[PDB]
Amino acid sequence: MREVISIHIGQAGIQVGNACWELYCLEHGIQPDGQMPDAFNTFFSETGAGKHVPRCIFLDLEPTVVDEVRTGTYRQLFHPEQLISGKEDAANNFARGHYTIGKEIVDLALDRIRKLADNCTGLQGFLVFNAVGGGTGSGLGSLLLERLSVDYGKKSKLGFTVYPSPQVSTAVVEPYNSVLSTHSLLEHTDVAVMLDNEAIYDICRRSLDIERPTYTNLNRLIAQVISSLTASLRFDGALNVDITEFQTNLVPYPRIHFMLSSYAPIISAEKAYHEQLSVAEITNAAFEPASMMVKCDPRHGKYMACCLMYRGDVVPKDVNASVATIKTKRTIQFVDWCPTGFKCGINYQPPTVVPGGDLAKVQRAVCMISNSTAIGEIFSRLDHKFDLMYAKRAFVHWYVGEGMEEGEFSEAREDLAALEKDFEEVGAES
Amino acid sequence: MREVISIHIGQAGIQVGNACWELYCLEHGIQPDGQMPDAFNTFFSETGAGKHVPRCIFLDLEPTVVDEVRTGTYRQLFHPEQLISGKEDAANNFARGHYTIGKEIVDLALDRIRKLADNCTGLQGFLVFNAVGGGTGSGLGSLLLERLSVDYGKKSKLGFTVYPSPQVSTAVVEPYNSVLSTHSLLEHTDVAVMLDNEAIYDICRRSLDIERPTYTNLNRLIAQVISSLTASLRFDGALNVDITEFQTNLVPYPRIHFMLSSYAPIISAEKAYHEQLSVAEITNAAFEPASMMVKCDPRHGKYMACCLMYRGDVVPKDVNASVATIKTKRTIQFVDWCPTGFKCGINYQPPTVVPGGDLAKVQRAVCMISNSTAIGEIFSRLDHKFDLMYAKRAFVHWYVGEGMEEGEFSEAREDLAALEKDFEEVGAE
Amino acid sequence: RAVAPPPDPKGRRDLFDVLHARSPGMPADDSWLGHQKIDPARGKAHPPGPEQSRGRRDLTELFTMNILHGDAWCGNILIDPARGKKPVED
Amino acid sequence: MREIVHIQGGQCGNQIGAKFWEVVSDEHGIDPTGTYHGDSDLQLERINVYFNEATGGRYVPRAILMDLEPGTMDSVRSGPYGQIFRPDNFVFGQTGAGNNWAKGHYTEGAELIDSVLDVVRKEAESCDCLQGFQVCHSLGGGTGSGMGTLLISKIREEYPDRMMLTFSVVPSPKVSDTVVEPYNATLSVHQLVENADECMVLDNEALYDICFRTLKLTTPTFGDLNHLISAVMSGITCCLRFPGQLNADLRKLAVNLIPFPRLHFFMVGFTPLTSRGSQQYRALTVPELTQQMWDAKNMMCAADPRHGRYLTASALFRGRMSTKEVDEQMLNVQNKNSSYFVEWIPNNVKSSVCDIPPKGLKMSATFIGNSTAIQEMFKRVSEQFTAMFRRKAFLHWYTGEGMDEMEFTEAESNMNDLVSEYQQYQD
Amino acid sequence: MREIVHIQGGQCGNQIGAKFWEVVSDEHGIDPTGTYHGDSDLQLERINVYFNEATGGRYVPRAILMDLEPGTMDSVRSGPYGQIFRPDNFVFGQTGAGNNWAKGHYTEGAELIDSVLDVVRKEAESCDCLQGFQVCHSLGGGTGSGMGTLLISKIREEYPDRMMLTFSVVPSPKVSDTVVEPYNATLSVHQLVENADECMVLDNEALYDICFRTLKLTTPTFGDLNHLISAVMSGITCCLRFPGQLNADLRKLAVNLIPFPRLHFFMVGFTPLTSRGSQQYRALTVPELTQQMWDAKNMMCAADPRHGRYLTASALFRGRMSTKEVDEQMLNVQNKNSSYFVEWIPNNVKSSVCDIPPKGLKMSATFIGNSTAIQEMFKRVSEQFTAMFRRKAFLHWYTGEGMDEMEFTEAESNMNDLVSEYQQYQD
Ligand SMILES: Nc1nc2c(ncn2[C@@H]2O[C@H](COP(=O)(O)OP(=O)(O)OP(=O)(O)O)[C@@H](O)[C@H]2O)c(=O)[nH]1
Ligand SMILES: Nc1nc2c(ncn2[C@@H]2O[C@H](COP(=O)(O)OP(=O)(O)OP(=O)(O)O)[C@@H](O)[C@H]2O)c(=O)[nH]1
């Protein structure tokens, strides 16, 4: 049997999870109380008679977001001890999330994955959600992936992670937390997916046509990306792809595992009738920079490996024709040592529209996950701003007071420094 | 499949377009919401289940014309992102729509063109609709025609351009805009069908017997003319003439591609009952000196090539009797080096009639497109007016400030002057 | 949970009727009959046309010579038969 | 066992070809479904010359459809007898020449000749013994003329010992349907003078004249043009498909009509044509065909045979006819008009009798004429080509895709070489 | 009584055999429940080759379904004709291969292959006499490639006197379903050369072209693709399941087609493929069956037969057929193009006749070709392998299970040796 454990750290993790577990109930007919009126084993465990409990944990130091789950419409769905809370928040301090006020919660956390581990038969992977901008997402996220590595070895912990945008940022101390959390993220996470808020802001403005998007509208299409790639484990298709299929096919080097993300028909209600959505058209729109989840130009880099997950009425010939059209096109450039640059995944069930949401009912959607050499431009951006604040030694007395010494920042800087040479070395022709 | 992308530039371009798509939806039976209760594949694209969206973009720097389409009865017919708007108009300045303002829209418009080019299986041509009197039609029209030559090379494009009239004008700097836009029309448009508003005003006055014709009466018969030549793509006939046929039969030299236009049966409802519409007389009415849509005198000129588009119940023998009668007539003239002048095109479907329009139901129709040396007198008046204002630098400071220097006027004056010398040498015997 | 596969546009499920000789079909209902990218069943719409509109006239009856088991003109090319003066009785 | 492979090119070839199998199939008794429904046993005796056996009793035409537009294949298939052809033989392109000869011959013809040669090669190997290829096309156009003439060149290199039967209509003297018709015809004629074994020259206004004077029809449609060609096209192969007292096949006509290898343009007419009111009053016998056979108003070419002397003649009489009346009427037209016949060939006329007439007609005949009066048609196209070429008008549409003015001077030279040798045999 | 034990491996292998047991049971007449409903005695005469008789008239196939992902056994069970298999034969694991050849061959293979051989030796020892094993897999994946070649190498050690008929879906030149296709193929072909007695190379891109050019199928699904390969697999064993005039079983074709032990890869084609529109037009005769047999597009492998010479080819004709057109057409294909055949073998091509046709079809034939033109298929994958191997791309995953870099060099060394051997006899 196939099943994945979803772990959501921090306020960014919970709010995506509120949109995520909103979506997962729609493909399986689960009411908010938890009573179905058997493909749910990936996310739901059959408990007692006619009650399903999600295979998740909602852990956060700040109690102000976990109680909203408790007082919300999904009170009866989640187990109460499953949701983990804390007395005080990390206040965007990585040192607090990792050393001082993080150790007392992670002991309670690991007893809760363990009970979900024994309840489930054969585990496929862990789906971890966090944001590097905050101390809870960085600090507790760095701790939790380390403990899962030493307890569940060689299990594919597939991660989705939110990164700071260049133009728009919500906290001053984001570059310090991003560099520190990435150093733990290289050696621990097998597959990580890059997410950036401002690109989705452009997506909501351009494609979905929303002038003022909110964080709830962001996570609704993010949860579609999570559900589409995991839909292969839930529902049968022509060319199914598992969690173990992604890591052995999109990770060319053990430290080059930072894959981009993109979605196809991000199309509103009135736009859907006039749009002629065909397999060739949605593949071309997938590789456009407008549909990219991260504000980075893919034209500056070379696609090392890309994976396409198709849902709906996709004949396998038309996706086979769309592979040829992209590779023949000169604008999309691949690396010289990878002729077999694509992977196709076809599932037979169309995506399920959230009622009251902004997305429309669409027959066909493509989740485009690509491993490129343009991720290093994002990491060159974070490296530059990290050196600017560290030169005058700004916002460091918060961190070194709460457990850390000075040495951890330099070693995290050098470890992240070797990444942009590694992305340059893998991109250079030979 | 045969299929053409018709695009409309400027205030005159869009008002032709919705007048055109009024006729196209009635011709194929498409309801205004886009639901039909394969001839549509030339202009419409099948979408999902029973939805037909036109292969058309509507671009203008001024949003006052575009949002009328978004509000009116055809709001559900068009895909919304096909309709492209702008922040400020070019405002009758060639340089504003060509260098400063139009560069922010020409990248957006050509991206939309490529999406329609990707959706189409085998492209046949393009139909541009612009007026050279205004800045958006001239400047943004010239900028978009530059990119269409480099993107889709050697591909047919049809230029339906409304030139300034000798007497009638709604613009002052239109001799500047028409001359500068013409320099783009020589080098990039393969086939350019000339149009002029004043000659259409004469047609409605004496034939359609309406003494108060507005723009929607003018653009309805223009919609009949463009639909007549493209009707071979949609319906079979005895002698089909598609878009590619117009290049190799009406363009003798690469820099001579301005052609007149005529629509022969132009009658009212009460006039149609008494009159007898016959193929022999409809060709004489087609070549009637007042029937053209461009203010020219073909007796002054000489026909270099002619194309006839016969519609309706036209047998293939009275049309050849009609062509034979024209060549024997001594009033009309044909150039000495082209003995085989005419091109005959016969279709099998009568033109549709709009409800509330001035036209009545007719069994036969002729659309005549001719290349003549009489189109050279359009530029002679255009050069005479342009040389007057450029003699002592009138209306130049609006053009100097927004990018274009003083050198482009000398190039446009000289290149159009070479066009005049091109016209007189080809008419020489 | 086996969700339904995408239905065929013309109800073809296993191509047994295509590979085997059962249920022969018309030359339409195929992908292409030209070279490529051409719908066989979807072509130019056909108007009634002049030959079918103007009565029954086809050249099969004139060539086959079925009259033994109309004229456009008689004599001069101008006039047509059965159109002349009104006959007056008494 | 003398099979004919038919190739139809372009707007002219497909519309003529669609009405061609209208006359072939019902003569053999074939329904639009494709089965057999005839009563006479002689119809079943020779079908393989034009049809191939199909499983289920169906008979499928031995035809190859070629074009550059998908319009005409939709026109042919929609009409009656439109489902008889194979879906495999409907090979064409999506571009469209647009009356550009070099588009059909060099650029847009290159990617399709290799495709249409495969179906020619497949069809030739299927039949045991080729009798000839039968192509119908135009000379004023660019699709059936440009790609058609390249097909004549390709099919002659592959099979140089088989007859070539080209049914080419020519640009008109009177009116013009295409503006560039002198350019395309002179380039097509230059490609036909070497490779085509025999060419039957037709014109549309010769067909316009017979249908308005002899047939006396008020509104003759576009199918009236095609039916007169189809009676001719079946009239050539009358001795093949049916038995007869005197047999004359496609090579038998070619040897007796062609004195020198470049004298292979023929003017052909059809004998038993009459109007509705004249049907009851005519006495259809052997001599009354002959006075209408040799009359120039019944001719189906632009050239008037009265101007130039007849080099060689032919007569394919169909029906239960007395040979002595075919004998004495043949000599009667020679002595009555002795100025119209070439002196250095005694007994110019060739005759043949087939005993099976067309469906419903009692007596019939077909006249194939090789005359030196046909130079006036070639001089008209050559004069119209020289007038345009001296100012290089409409030439950038031809030279833009890989042609220079060298072969335009060559095609003009071979044109004037062709009309000079017609004129010296007139002397 | 010449039994064949069938094994299906991986996601592709389970799906190709799901349509295979649907076709071969429809030929023999077994309903999806399991009973017999045929109308001929000859259908039940040879059912021991693919089915085991059970109590109550039930028939169970000699099929072993193996994979590592339980999704595909849900696909074959929920699909039609999925209840016929033995529940004890559903041997597999739960971990999933993840398209890794090393995982499919080394880590989880140790626990899986112990249980599978118990099922296979139960099927082999049950029947009285073995003919061979018919396995089906792909070379681009890891669930059927690494696991299948581990099974094939292990089963040939146990049964060396029985043949091994393997069906492989090789990677495409134009597209790629998996990123590690050159890694999976070059290691799998390194194992197939010494273990499998002969291999029949299949690929989607040749099937996709067949489904669009000849079949003219609008929406070719994987169920559409599976039937084309499965129609071959019935036709290869047609002389075993049915009596024939000239019998040719699975060892008859082995000695005929294979000159040297290293050269045992074939390009395969099923002959009477017609579209739905062209069913009535095409007449099912042997000479037109031969030209479709030797058409390059009708081959179900992407290697073009025109590039290389055929060493030895075989044909499995089925139906009521006489044996000159079996022999003369195979003689005619030699003399028509002798350059495309190996000179030092007289009469390279080969044929045999079984008088029992498939259901509802009159004539049919299955073509097996061993040509040297398949070297560019192995040359391209070797070219794709050396590009990735120099940069060591996608190798830290493969070396994780315990494959050293030396084995990748040895796999590539055999590819250059095998591609040179085909070029050795091409000159
Ligand atoms: N996509 C998405 N991102 C969010 C959302 N909410 C917050 N974020 C991002 O997440 C970043 C901080 O993430 P967290 O580590 O979870 O913040 P936290 O858990 O409150 O950590 P503390 O403030 O220290 O308690 C912010 O900078 C936001 O940009 C959301 O609802 N959706
Ligand atoms: N035939 C026709 N011509 C029109 C119509 N409306 C305007 N015109 C012509 O258009 C010219 C005005 O220039 P335009 O190109 O329309 O100006 P514009 O499109 O608004 O461009 P900007 O002024 O820069 O915003 C006038 O000279 C008219 O002759 C119309 O409805 N029909």
Ligand SMILES: Nc1nc2c(ncn2[C@@H]2O[C@H](COP(=O)(O)OP(=O)(O)O)[C@@H](O)[C@H]2O)c(=O)[nH]1
């Ligand atoms: N007799 C006859 N002539 C035709 C027919 N169709 C076209 N033509 C002649 O062919 C000329 C034009 O041919 P065209 O359409 O350009 O052929 P294309 O090259 O295939 O495009 C005209 O002068 C017509 O008179 C036909 O069906 N019958």
Ligand SMILES: Nc1nc2c(ncn2[C@@H]2O[C@H](COP(=O)(O)OP(=O)(O)O)[C@@H](O)[C@H]2O)c(=O)[nH]1
């Ligand atoms: N004909 C056919 N091919 C298939 C099918 N499913 C997958 N494939 C092919 O198998 C290849 C991928 O191999 P894979 O299934 O991952 O092999 P595995 O690792 O053993 O499961 C692709 O190139 C597909 O074309 C099917 O149902 N039919």
Ligand SMILES: [Mg+2]
């Ligand atoms: Mg917080």
Ligand SMILES: [Mg+2]
């Ligand atoms: Mg004889």
